[model samples]
Target chain A: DIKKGLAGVVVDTTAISKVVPQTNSLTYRGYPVQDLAARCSFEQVAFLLWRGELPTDAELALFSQRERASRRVDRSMLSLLAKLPDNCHPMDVVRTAISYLGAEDPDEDDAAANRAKAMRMMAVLPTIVAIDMRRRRGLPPIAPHSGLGYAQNFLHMCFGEVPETAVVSAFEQSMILYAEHGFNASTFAARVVTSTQSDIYSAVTGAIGALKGRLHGGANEAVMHDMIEIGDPANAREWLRAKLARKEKIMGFGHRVYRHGDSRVPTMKRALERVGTVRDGQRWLDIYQVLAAEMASATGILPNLDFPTGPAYYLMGFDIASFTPIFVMSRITGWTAHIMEQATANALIRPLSAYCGHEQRVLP
Target chain B: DIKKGLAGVVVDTTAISKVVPQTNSLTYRGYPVQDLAARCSFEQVAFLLWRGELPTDAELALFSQRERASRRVDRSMLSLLAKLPDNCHPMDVVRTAISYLGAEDPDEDDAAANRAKAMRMMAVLPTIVAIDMRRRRGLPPIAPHSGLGYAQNFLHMCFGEVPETAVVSAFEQSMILYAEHGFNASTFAARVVTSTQSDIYSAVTGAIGALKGRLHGGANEAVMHDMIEIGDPANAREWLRAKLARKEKIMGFGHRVYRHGDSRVPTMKRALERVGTVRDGQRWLDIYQVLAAEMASATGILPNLDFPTGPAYYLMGFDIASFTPIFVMSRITGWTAHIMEQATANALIRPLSAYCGHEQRVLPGT
Candidate 1:
């Protein structure tokens, strides 16, 4: 008897960390976001999501080796990326490119192998993003050096040269910040697809589609664009005031789950401080903080993870539009983990809706 | 403030028809499923989902004409489909084929023209399914005849010539049976994609991926396989009994939404009567009914829409495996309408989850 509404149904139980919305907190395998964000590199986070715990030294070493080996894009995929339109949204390009890659590879079965493939995906998604950016700009993708760390290698591939140490560190923190969030839309979609006993690529591909929606992972990029459109801190308050007056949403201010505060915001804010922001960028950050204070005072809405991360990426010299793409790069790890977890259950994540629409009218 | 579970969040306050699980009833735009199943064609059902009413005569004429005119598949798409492996699952092949078609068609992005294009897709998806099936079997795709009705054309194209009139009627009824279900997983996925202002092809493409999952729309095919595995009517009870003992689900017997019964089941069963089932086919139907009765007596479970439709397709000469692909063909219409409705709202369907997993473990350096 499959119950209507599925109110008490346990769809799948995962060992991955749960999200506590009231506290606005997340954990990966019982590790807090605060703890993980402070110490772990993106590679360490990737290992945790994949293996279900913090990786030991030898485990981390083996994981890094496999990931590093999988960093190069196939030549065919490079040609395909080159053919993409210049104005194509990065998400579309990445999504299509990933699908094409999956078609070429075709891991139709084999869950354990696909789990490894998923880790390779998490490892290389950032490379893919950076390579696509460079290819579209008419630059060849720089071969990633073995000596470079994860974030530095991506920066090198993206810019066709090494970035400053500070820039690399700042970007690394962004990856750590975005690495995991419990049951966000894309992750949930991944979990749902995984529940069908589908392969990992299918789950990740579905996750990409979900993340492309503006209300989920795409919100960060939108926040940065809103900041740019506001021009400067001088106009920021008035602009926000007007938008709030008109009942227009200020993109980065609040979250559906995080009512009090997001755990990642302050951590990313510290990273932004270490990056030493630019003039207009710092102005935006200051104004955003003040706006957050005012909103908290007035409407009791706290700033979300997107708020600080938006300005942080802008100051790191990434185009505001690329914030969400960077998010895709970071979040793929968590999505893949969820996919693997869901695949283990082998149940379909089919929830019923309470219908409230027109009755069966005639066909026309 | 947004609550943790969002149990009472009124995402939309529109007038879509309700699914009454207690009574085993479904209504579209306020009319019963029985009425729609008896009187409406697949196209009419599509119009009902999209426009919220029965089409006027003028609207019906124009709709069919537009759909008929757009039934032709592109030469490039045919070549691309040819390149896929012969062993590829039909669902995967169709999913890839549609994305390729979208890439090849310049008209795919014109939003003002989306409704017409969606109708074309709704008409031609079955053609694509049939053509792919034929091609995989080492036969050339039969050219679609514009002179025939939508269901008849698909039948002709799939069978390499016009099927028998009885078979055609069965296929048509199956199409109408699978056409619409309010907010099923695939349709919900389509709606979610469209809510992001994505193009029609993206929404449909996403829907196809969702439908490919066996637990949702793929049950009809599974139901047919269950019959084959059972092999004979005498074995049906013992087989199902064993499955019940093992706690394995009997695919078309249960549903997620309908707790009492599936409203579409009786109409489908009645249509099966009009079509007059063949030897083993009627036996399979009886076996299914017995199984349903026994399950109901034992645990109060009932047959879903997939239960009868599975055997019906078997009787129509469709391989049991093709049941879900056929579903993809009909349900494309409902998916498109939902996509359009979701597009109108433009609020991305991002829902929060009640996270109940590991809280926080620390790394040593921190």
Candidate 2:
């Protein structure tokens, strides 16, 4: 029997995160994700995802020190970044950067070293993203600050200063919320690559590629594009209706796993509203509300995390194209956690296929 | 229950290649792989893998022309390759090069463009591998000869000249044999990446990573290393017994699918023997025979394709590390063919995981 799309097939067991459709709740290691997003720093959540429990003060200090110390991208990496054509997608840059990082780090070949490799990528990805951001605008990359928290440092590196408190808090919460989701397309891709006993960088690199597709992490970017296309709250309903009439897929409304509404959308919606207040983005928020109401009323579909995240990131001054690379930043934590988990109890992941082509015909 | 290792679990249906265990035979698009190896050049076989039929003479000429013209890598790629640390595996180099190629080709974002993208990569990969081979030896790359055929040009680019008729013939046979296998680890990895609607380059890049594992495409390299370790035919039985006694796994002896020796082994064994004759490699052949006989008599296991192809690559003067990358040169055909096939009928390919971790609880400080 062929399990096409592996839609409901449970390939293996995991201890990382659980998606419970029953309660519309998601948890990272046992802490409710909303609770984690509310109470924990992105740094704390990253540590929790990797180490299986929330870190103590001493552990947080050690992990923070290691992460901060690893922020500087190598000079060779800088040169390589400079060479990537501007027309390429930011996710491609991220993929190449991860591949380049793996190539430069002599220790990456050993799956055991992935614990540090994960931290290295998680810390350094912001710098790469910020660098590419500045390059697109013809500005030089700003240095990352050890004094800043993970969210603030990413802001500073991208814009040379952090936004207001509401913006920073929302950004951090989004990072925490997006950090891990078990068996999603990108994380599953990472696990499959890891199951082959390939290096961690290869796994993460492939994960980045899967995340680049329009069906996955790229959905956020598409959402922002849809928002701009509608341009005003008044146009949102008609625009969505026309798209529906054409049977075009809406980017941020429905999810494969969640039925009523995405578990993270409420938290992210609050984050979006806060950013709207700070950035005077009521127009974007109004459009979001219009689209969500229309989709829910017509089709019983509700907003996913990306629905709120798309406008939230826009209101925070990120370019629309940078949304998915920002995803690579947060999701790197989850991808690497899954990588280590798969490597610990490995499988080849080579599945059989029923032959449908030719029987035993000779070459013509 | 979880399909751990996906053992015997058919993930999907394919029209690419078939593995028939009953007769110990493999076929690509319905033609027996061994027969195709005997009759077709690597170029012709690559066309067949991608197109699902052997190319007519006119079709072959057009396809070859397009492939030949696409062989030059960009200068940006060369600089990137130069910067990569020499200590990294060659497969890593191949991965980065494919990623770089994807980044450069603006059209790569369209899955629809993969048909041409496949040919582009298939043509460019040999040049990439040949250049990396030279760099590892502190030599500059030789230009690819336009006049040479696919197999001949690859050999010439790596060594600055093609070998004897027997060596060229064996090399071509190995490429055809190694061209495709149904739903192997690397091809499945490519399909997995493509299932997300990712680009062909990403799929191929991930496939390269999967193949780097010792259990898959890297087995050939491991086999060569084992051969060198044995060093003599006289030591084959005892060395194998010691390995067996220690319960160590031999690289080339067993396959997950084949119970009767691998279907392609007889053809590859003959190729290995031919290379042995041309290159004065009789000792290597004797070692091969002794090891095959001992493993078979002891465990009823036989050598897979990697078993013969490994020493054959050695006899043809490839570095042990370069063997897998050479496999990439051929398997790129199979990988991209599968990429196009998967993209045409897209699915997310996402399987669920059973969670056995901790229960939901409040944060300790909360």
Candidate 3:
């Protein structure tokens, strides 16, 4: 039988992250993601994902310094970003910027150079994203602040100032949770592109494209759209039931891999509640609680990380469309790690297709 | 067993194209590719690959007219292409241009709109490529002439005049042969991107990345590089033995899917010979025949399509770097066809990976 979607096919081995169904855990570099999110910074998680170990103080200091230094893109690049239609999707903006960056970089081939490319992208992606988001609101770009952490720099760049500590912590935690997932579509897409020995930027560009699908990283945006359309906490259960009646897909529930529940949802939900306390977010909480109860009571389906992430980002004062671009900023760590690994043990990933169309015959 | 490269595993069913091993044939929409290359223009083959049937004369005229009309890109886009570093790879230029094009396109989300997007790209790519090539030579962009056929217009746009009939036919035939192949890495990359329901330009952009790999479409460029390094037919066999002695890969000689030979090689080889006859191309022909014979006798590995295509483009006045971009110009048809096909019946192509890392641990502080 054809393995449609390669659903259950374990194509290779990974040392980066894994979803353990027996314990209902997601682990990165052998540490539980929830544990890391609670105790570690996004930078620590990124370092861990890439280097296979959490960074020591010296290592982290250097890593952060390099990332900070690289955050300033040229005004010429900003001009190119301005050239894109303002109404276009933010993911497209990120994609175009990265493609241009790839063309500009002269050293994208060697192993050390590839790692540098990844580092530069991780640093500059937030700046690109923040500048684009600000442009959407008719606000000029806010320069990156080296004094801030990665997440704080991003929030500050977008809004011209960072939020309260609870919000920053919640945002950083979300980044950790979304940092890596093994063999997901976007990560797999990056690996497949890298399998051709393509440059790191091309791999990342392809990953961004994969993440734009509503079924993938875009799920967080879809979830927000659905929640806003429902618009009231009192109607949450009824709204969900009506959706069920039509057999419409509820955007954030269910997953391809997790059966009992998505393991990362609880940590992200806690982050959501933390952000909720400061942002007059009880209405969203009530809606979320009612929807969660209804979903659990009606079906055994569980919420994925996107379920909590969508509202968490909403409560943190982000535009609904920028949620996927936020996912891109965090997931770059995973995609690049996979790209390097695939390059180390390379093969051209070309699969066969069973011909089901017309039989071989002469052209008319 | 792990299907490491998905080498022999069938991932899904495709009605678009197939490689029949029993007869060593490659068929697109039930037509042998060689047969199509022999009888059809590149435009007709593009229409056939897309619509799955040969167009009527009227259909062909309409298709050609639309393609010709869309050939001119805006000056704004030309400015952006010019902005890329002159020293950067041409593949990178094409990738960036397509990504920008995707971002600018407002109607990339629907079925009918997707077809129009594909048609527009088929028309515009050669113009972009020709302009980039011209800029590399420090020349100004030449406006595309609407009176010319697809192949002739591309030549005209690049060099300000159409080549003789022999050169145009050879170029057009090379295009038909490279138009499509079943599930090559680049085509698979395009399909994977489209599997996400991403825009067609994104898919094409990703495919260009895959094609940039030296193992895939970049093999054509690598072939020409090898030939240029050899530079004389007298050293062809000795050069092959030395490279073989060192166990270095000789590009354009083998393919993963074809055991006997690539099915498209003969047709492309004929085209290369025709171009050779006109361009005093006997040097390339001599080196090609000697290296091919040595490799065949040495390893029973025959030349694939890239083997003939590299010298063919070189003789036709293209830079070695632009060979893969030329492949992109033709394969855009195949990529878009696969994109539309995957979008029509889509699934998220998520695969599994066995965890081989740390079992379980705690942070030092935690």
Candidate 4:
């Protein structure tokens, strides 16, 4: 009866998104996540999370125009990044960049100010992410493309041109799939940071810190790490079998809310298959099928979305280290929406910790 | 029962500090905070939080020497801060400075590197806080006085030199009182950031953001704002009557932990009273005593530490805006201590929320 993780505890109500227990399906603004991943674009999902409705063509046009216009980060921020030691994690670069932007913001804590900052964060984060990806690879940064769609533009910035439609669609679908989840750690960290009425930048900055942990969004990177360690279709079964026998967690398998199955895996797996078909990608999927099949029989735990997302990102030419930051790239919409929701509701999320420390004693 | 504010749920264990319900007194490493406030310097209390005991004289000498040695920030950092808009809050300045420093750290997340950064933060924050105060006043910043101890050096950094022993001791005692409190919002914010196994600067930066909230340490600034609004002792009763009639909660009057009285108030009140004797004071206290007495009798709520500490800070030459940042300068010790503790026993602090959100629906094909 006691909830250690506050699992299924109703702390507050949110209008942005939810995971329904009936189907164990997640939704953004009342639409099934798998459906959105199929029909709508990542920009549409981001618009829905922020504005509480999908955008019409006219609205989407204006919104896209505004967003595309804001894509280039200030030259000063770029210079700041160059000065930061290369030892900083990609998450640290993104987090510190937001902090620097917030420090420069004139009306930092006001609601209007936060909304403006949120738009800028969404627009410019891809450039920072792409720049960081290259910086890790011993390459200089590239500018973001204004003409390309959001996902394609991200690809263009990182690798100089977009890939095939199959690959770009897979990447876009991954973005939509990862865009929002219900009160996940990073979004909740954003909410907690905003509950203090800090700027959107501060909340996002702290959220990035939370996302860097091994437990939350970082799972995507670990997923890819495990895939590379397994390496081939031949090693998949033995690797997973030994890991399961040792009582190790298969990184991309179980989830908190879904007991039946993860809601988005079917759609994301299809995307992965499409990417594999466009390229000779059966080897990675072969390993995935083997490991996922063995693990399903072993633990009765279905593959979470990250199972396919891990390999799908690899097929799209992203480094394994860039995987979690890519998750942040999508999840920023969710974090910013939750921060806005928390500000409107305005409750201090100060839950009590039953004290287990020392009792009063005189100082020696 | 649904605990809305998580009023009494035991989420985890901490060895850092606690508020004992029997006495309603807070302690750091089992030492009574009130006793520490009366006897120990801020450096001593900081050491106790990080290392579980007061330092011996030899240890204290080395600790003080190391702390003073780390006081001046790098010139590059100073240049970065100067680039920030002058209108930014001091908390923002300090938070962003730590973020920048963390980014500059060659060993970003290693344990030894974080410990070194924590030490640097403890020593250098007063200089940052003082620099921010001077920037707001349109004055060029003053260098810290190295010959001075921690408290005197902080005073010297803000103004030209340290004030009287009465004023300096009062400031030192306030630092000790404010150095640590158990699982308050700011400290908890730091813990949540640390719970991610993030670097110390991220934890401290996030904690600074939380402390900027008006409901937490910012309450001291609000307390000062209210006292200044009341302005005259003659208006105390009328002010209290009007505030009570409107059912407006007075800042710093009661606390979440203590139902009877805030334990640290007596010691902090005496410090405020001592400062009043040294300089031209008594008006703020006159208004304070009237409203506090009125509130206690009317609502059975007692005044907390911030009530006296607010005016005690005002009695010193600090601007009202710098009160919370001064708190960050002291509470950085507590924040860093908790961050270290949380990282030692790392767990993700993810809590759950019951989903009242809409059920799944199919998307219409475009």
Candidate 5:
């Protein structure tokens, strides 16, 4: 019962998502996420997380319009973006921008008002993200094109002019796979903020801070950084062996909950292979397989979603630092959904501490 | 055990502070906080939290120099502050300012680096709090005065000059009392973030966001807001009765951890009386007694730190909106201390949740 790290202790119940132990099967709102990644658009997944059901053709159109309309942020925010020091991490930029949104949003009382805030956040976050990426490179920003879908619009804002539909589709599938996960650290962070009956902006801003940690969302960047260090498939075997001999921790290998294997890895890896076929990316795939084989046989540990996600984002032309911020852009739905759930049916999430500091003694 | 609100669960250990059950006594770094408040200043309490003991006068003199030297923030943050709507809550201002500090801080690797950042945050936060208040009133912020102590510098920055020593002393006690507590919501939020090995800024930033909630640090402002609503001593009983009749929640009542009563209340009420005696502020104290008597008799509820604190700061001429931000200006020490503590002996503080929403059915589209 006194579990360190709160491992294996179920603190509270959530209806958001579930990872069944037998198959490591992950579900979002009762739907198997793997199939949804293949069949549903990223917008559809966002809708499911928000409304608890798939949007029909008519509903998707209205939803898409409202989203696309809000894709551009206030121009003053762009000025604010330019003010953050260039050395600033993209995660910090994205998080502060959310806090600024909280300052602007007037709705904090009603659940329906909170949902509207969430929808607007979903639309505007990618814009702020794309703007941060572009501003970091000293590149001029781009306006959001109305005709494009969510994933394509994000690519366009970051790189300007959408890529081939195949690359766009691969990117969209990555968004869907990353869209929602159950009670992850960042989602729990957001939920804690909401449990205090705070606004969605504060919740999301706090979640972004949690996700900036190297253990959680930063794993994607670490995976790519590790592969680049090994550099080639031929070197991966010896490099990994030496790493194991030194007892070093490696990124992208296994997760706490998914021991059978990550349910989302193949869905992510499939997107990676399709993305790898272009732009000389197959070498990273070669490194991926060699490490996968060496590590699995040596330690029985398999890769997680961040494994393929790291290189895939790289191939899509995002910088290494942009990976976690991109994760924030995708994971916003899950975080806000948990926030809404906590707000509607709430309890204080306060935990106790065993006093290990000092006994009662007067100051000397 | 799967605990709700973590009511009875001790998930981890802390060396910072402890609240004893039987006597309702509290300690910071093994020192009685009441003694600290009565004998030492607020800066000494902050030093104790960070350095783990009361500072020698020589040590404190050096510590005060380092803190005062770093007290001024980058003026560009003023432009950012200027841009936020005047209607913005000061807690949001402080939280955003801390996030900005994180982006600007370069060192986060080791214990010393975190300590340096924590010291800088402690030094500069009062400046940010003061600037936010000044900007709200369409007035320019005053810079810090090296000649004064930490509490004096803060009071000076807010009002362009320090008030009477009695008011400053009362304010200092409130800061010392608010500096740290064990495993409260905001502190837990900071710990959870730090459990990821995140930097002190991120941990402290996340803590500010949590403290902005009504149930935590916001309770200070809430107590003041409620007292202001009750308006006169004549209205206290009827207002409380209406609240209880509707079963509506009341602020400044019982706490989750302190069942008997808040251990800090008598000390804080004494300071409030001192502050009230000087400023025609006894009317607020009159309302306080009536409500305290009625809540205790009607609901067996008691006053906590925030109850008296709501008016002490108010009497010092601080705006109602600036109270929680003041809480941040002091609590930053506790938050960063816990953040560094979590990082040095690190563990990812992830808790598992029970699935209540749905079964493992395939997507309806699938």
Candidate 6:
């Protein structure tokens, strides 16, 4: 009977971590984000989101086996990928082609059967993103390498061979950092749609739509563009200072909820350090830290999940444009988990809004 | 912060009136169901949801004019619709075709411009639904008839210029009756999508998917199928009573939220009365009322929005199978209004759930 005007409502069931950005904290399965980022791998994170905790050794073994088994897309998806428009955003092609693959599966309705499908989605999403990138460049998609792990497989798919050991490790760390964040827009969108008892494809489709928005998953790609336009680290501070003076939003700098810091940043930073810095890589990192400090001292705002992540991808051989799609590669796990969660508690997530619009005028 | 397990969280939004079964109720401008269902037309209801009040005469005229002007689909949409598979579900075809329409209109992003686009959607959705149906049957597609009112034009589009006055009025009343209800599942789905500042087509497409679910807008078709299986009105009681005895859900009866009755039932019932019952029509109504009474006496449940609505559409010359699609035609207005409302406030509608399936297990390295 209470009229809350739809601003706040518990609309669906999701096991995703919550982000009270105002408090600058993050958690997964009731564990602090700092702890997980410090200790867990991306594969472990994937298992956690899907099964609601870290996996036992046998369970992780089975999980890895299933993921490796489903890592390859069918020839039909590849053929369909070939037909897509060259100029199409890789995200668009990935989303559409994933939906098509989902349509072809036999057990679309059975959630128990869908556990394998979810693993397939996680395994192949990177392939879809990478292959679409290659296809756009007028190159053939590389076949999956049987010996590779998740990150190694994606690198092989994109570049047609294995990368150096350090690059592979760096990419794996990137995946771990991107794997999950609690109840963000795309994850929430997935949960909301699935709450209506819609299928996985529908929920994921809605997630893709939400992720396309600038405020959500698209932020990383935008940040990469900003860094590119800023050129070298020499120009970074002045460029950022100018952007700050103009009150233009630095794409990767601040977050809506996390006020103190993004939990994933330290782990990502550690990974980058472990990989050994390239020329001026330390300067780039210094520029980012100094800028983050400036923003913090001035406005009390902190660098968020997107800030460090974009340059990390940049320092690797990946194009700035591909950052968001790679994020999708990891985040699909959380999305599918949320979808399953919502399905178990199926209810229409409808909320009401106060009508604050023009008064009714006569139609003529 | 608070972890609650998944509760359906059903609430009574308003007092109910009866026509169908299932837990159903209605609300308008945050007002009670009984008031709006009794006093409103489709236009007034649309106005209330969109503009947040009953429209004056001049306002109603302008709203109708905008809607009428927006009725024509662009040539590109037509071509895209033409390319759809003949076997595709009408809803799927319409939903897919509308997304392509998004690419053509340059003003698609501007909300005021899209308001007119939304009106075009409101105007042409029935046409899209109807034409898709005919296309699947290998019948020639029908164009919108500008000379007719919105509902009448939809009737013509569906049945190819039928002149049965009784059928037209019945269909028109059905349209009005189904026009708006506060935050129903499909409308809510659309609103949730739109609140992300997504385009109207995405919102509408999400809505179509939601409406296709059996627990929601699909009730009407289920109701009709149940009626047909009963074979006659006399058998309705026996069959329904048997189903009730077996604890099977009698479609179009009892609602989740409406305890008293569904408010839209009376408006639809009054329209049926104005047309005066046909031979089988009055019999079906009598059977439905008896079922309502029996259920009420036995279990204290009342008739719902879908109960009489199914039979009413069946009487109006629509195929029993197409009854739910007809609801989609009118309910699009409410969906559009709700989408606009949700977009204005713009919060990501994400919520938490209590984890019940499994507890934490340690990682291998740990």
Q: How far off is residue B105 in model 6, in Å?
A: 5.4
Error of 2 at A26 (Å): 0.9
Residue clash pairs of candidate 5: A15-B357, A357-B15
Which 10 consecutive residues of model 5 chain A have the lowest summed lDDT?
Answer: A103-112
Worst 10 residues of 6 chain B by lDDT: B11-20
What is the iRMS for every candidate structure?
6.2, 1.2, 1.1, 2.5, 1.6, 6.7
Off by over 4 Å in 3: none
Q: For residues A1-364, what per-residue lDDT tens digits would candidate 1 score against the true structure? A: 3222222333444576666545556777777776777777888887877777778899988888887888877776666556555565677666665555555555554677767677767767877787766666667777877877788888877776776776777778788778877566567656655554545665666667677666666778887788778776677667777888899766777564565678788887777777655324567666676777767766788878887788777777676656777888898887877777666655555444455666445433
Task: Give the true-contact fraction for every prediction, in order.
Answer: 0.21, 0.76, 0.80, 0.52, 0.69, 0.14
The model with the greatest DockQ is: 3
Where does candidate 2 chain A have its weakest 10-residue lDDT segment? A253-262
DockQ of each: 0.25, 0.76, 0.80, 0.51, 0.70, 0.22
Residue B119 CA error for candidate 5 (Å)? 0.6
Give the alpha carbon lDDT tens digit for every residue of B123-226 in model 4. 98898888888888887778876788999998888888788999999999999888877667777777777765667877787888778777677778889999
- CA shift at B236, candidate 5, in angstroms? 1.6
Off by over 4 Å in 5: A108-112, B108-112
Instruction: Estimate, for each residue in B1-366, the C-alpha lDDT of model 3 and write its tens digit.
Output: 577888887888888898777888888898898888888898998998899888999999999999999988887898898888998889988988888887778886565688899999999999999989999999999998999989999999888889888888889988888888878888888877777777788788888888888888889999999999999999999989999999877899867788888899988888899989889999999999999999989999999899999999999998888899999999999988888888888888888888789988876867
| TM-score, cand. 1 vs. native | 0.85
Ranking by lDDT: 3, 2, 5, 4, 1, 6
Q: Is the docking of candidate 1 incorrect, acceptable, medium or high quality?
A: acceptable
- TM-score for each of the candidates: 0.85, 0.97, 0.98, 0.92, 0.98, 0.78
Chain A TM-scores for all candidates read 0.90, 0.98, 0.98, 0.95, 0.97, 0.88
TM-score of chain A of 3: 0.98
Report per-prediction Cα RMSD to one decimal: 4.6, 1.6, 1.4, 2.8, 1.5, 5.7
User: lDDT of model 3 at residue B144?
Assistant: 85
Task: Supply candidate 3's per-residue lDDT for A233.
Answer: 92
Q: Judge candidate 4 against the unseen true structure and give its global Cα lDDT, from 0 to 1.
A: 0.80
* Model 1 reproduced share of reference interface contacts: 0.21
User: Candidates sorted by DockQ, descending order?
Assistant: 3, 2, 5, 4, 1, 6
